[model samples]
Target: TVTEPVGSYARAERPQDFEGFVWRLDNDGKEALPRNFRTSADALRAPEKKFHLDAAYVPSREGMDALHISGSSAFTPAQLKNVAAKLREKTAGPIYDVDLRQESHGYLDGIPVSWYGERDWANLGKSQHEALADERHRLHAALHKTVYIAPLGKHKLPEGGEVRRVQKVQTEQEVAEAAGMRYFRIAATDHVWPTPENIDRFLAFYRTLPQDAWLHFHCEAGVGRTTAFMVMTDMLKNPSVSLKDILYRQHEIGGFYYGEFPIKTKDKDSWKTKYYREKIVMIEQFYRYVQENRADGYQTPWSVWLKSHPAKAL
Candidate 1:
């Protein structure tokens, strides 16, 4: 229970410290990280081993290679290899790495992503809608590029911010599997929470994993998006915990959006305020969603509930 905040997001004062947890968050952004993850206090350490945040539902198997972990990864040509090699060495068996980033900034938008590195982005001059739609026929081919799959995780390109999406993830997923690792894709927009649909998709996939599976997550900074997913999964495991407490504890584990967990209502009109509010509401709603399912003995899955109750009204 040694909680410590990393340098990037260590400014906020905890109103009260979480009694049992080790806090750690560092950007590990665009700069190239060392190829080798194992080192003697090498500074480029392995992702956090988060077995303590055990799930009541998906109990992590207690074994040599059952360690569940996560953290940031710089987006680059060796990005998938970087994460894969490290996870391979650390967890050793039954691993799932979740990719949460828009396409333009991730696998698809990169010419480097195609095994051939020849596939081009939709003509920037064309309307984004028309450009992306026109490429639909070739999207499948783009995903399976077996050559170099760089420009992974967080990436950037023209109109990429607006046009990036899960299809990019599919491309990365294809490459990840080829490299012999499990890659799960989620359309988690940077600096924000996942839409309920995406959230449901994650839960559905997660519920199907082996009990001993190791889990990892990455976005650009491994700060905001990573933190949100960590919190959501923690909530999934311990729905009984107060949402505020869950968030506060995570802030210690992974420094969040600078100031606080749930922002003040007084800052109602702020863009930051609104974004966090949506995420908080989603977490709370998801808590209820989980509870409702647990209440009835797991009679239905989230994917099914999503359709029957498609409204998922805010």
Candidate 2:
């Protein structure tokens, strides 16, 4: 037991029993939803937890084929062109644009534009089988079977760029539609619940996609949502990679996430944060879900992932 020399110390016989003396009951360490920190006091101590790399933080030789991009607002014509040019300079594969604005509100100020949704929609040149020739713009995209994108709100594309619009943003139906094309959502509606439903939903979609398909995902600023997606993808492709490694790369994907996301409480009596009660445990569940449903069906996600190494799913 840790006998305090000054404060009211009690009997916490072992490290595992430390909770007996203090803390609350909800501090079960298991899932990946809340990210870490088990108790409510831990939540208070988070600002004090220094950003240190964990044992599992290792670098992989592989890079994500999907390029994720998002911001608070749509880019200007010059800005959009610059981004396109930069992307063209980097990779040779077909570039799929993810403009969230297209999925939600329409454009802002009145202006003439002709980018993807209107012009180079889904990169398919105007041809046969196209549906919505003017409004909706569904014909070409649907005929070409490609994604189309516009700005966040109501707006047309620039003059020449490939893009696809995700019809909706916050609905399960919309999420499914977007996933069919290999796009992922970044919202954290259930911080504490962290249901594996989203994981299962993604996997179900993943199975239907071509093995060579690449998906790019992001949420508003791409901080919390981006981190969540990275964790899911990394788990899918590199289960053996250490948790610390996945987390470190997260900072690189976005930036320091200080006070950016909710952390799970260490105990039950602890004040509830947006983070789910089973954060870590639920994360493991996602791994297990992938494992359970693998083509080989390995009984457990961790075990199944162990058998497949180095981007087997990609």
Candidate 3:
């Protein structure tokens, strides 16, 4: 229950504020986001930050290992030993870690994210079409299964075309089986994050699954791309949205873009120090797109949203 300015909506005031939600412009330059107040503080910032799982998802079984591995996806000898150690320490069954690698970045445990940008733009691409097409082939070759993934929430790439998406997946269906954890692939891009194609493939996966699923998300260093995607999901979970809640939630995630969320390049010439001035312009334009076509009632949150994200007829 927070009050937010309804004036014409503009580019997100702050990305980190809204934990589980993100903004995206459609193929035709339309923008979309959730109306719910989604935001959280559970995000990685500096090096040494490790993703932890909720205790509720752990199992009580004390006998055999929890899972089996096959094919090239098998664990390394050292990795296998580590699993044994953890099981022995906890007196639990065996444990296995799943891999969700993409073109540039791979997976790591206890690795401090946000320390570097090597995989920062893990999924950054010229267009969502390019990103998704790449993922379709990459993921197709990586594993075989229907994942309830949420590839970084969709967005219009700087190159413009398809929406860039975050990838969401479950290591195992059972909360206890997965140790109550889910893995997410965050596309690393420049200061601004972009959307890849076929983005819905992942979002649709999450809607029907049972709630209480442990979710995991990451990009290089877990700062930029990872933070953005995690917050976007928080937005998806809320039934109401507001600028106040968005910013508040972002800070909670500890991944506040630090003003790094990407903006439309506008032909490379759009570069200037007007980030503050034009930011609202770009964001508000997108807000209207979502309100008009996506939001159920078009409640008209604010005038800025209308002025910025005006419809063709307006």
Q: TM-scores across all candidates?
A: 0.53, 0.41, 0.36
Which scores higher on lDDT, 1 or 3? 1
Better of 1 and 2 by TM-score: 1
After superposing candidate 3, which stretches have Cα over 4 Å from the reference?
A: 1-103, 107-190, 196-202, 257-314
Candidate 3 on 167-248: residue-level lDDT in tens?
Answer: 4311211222333223334233434422222123334544544443433333222244344444344444442464334433
Find the candidate with the highest TM-score and give its number: 1
Q: What TM-score quantifies how close candidate 2 is to the native fold? A: 0.41
What lDDT does each candidate get? 0.46, 0.33, 0.31
Higher-scoring candidate on TM-score, 1 or 3 = 1
How many pairs of residues collide in each model?
A: 6, 46, 70
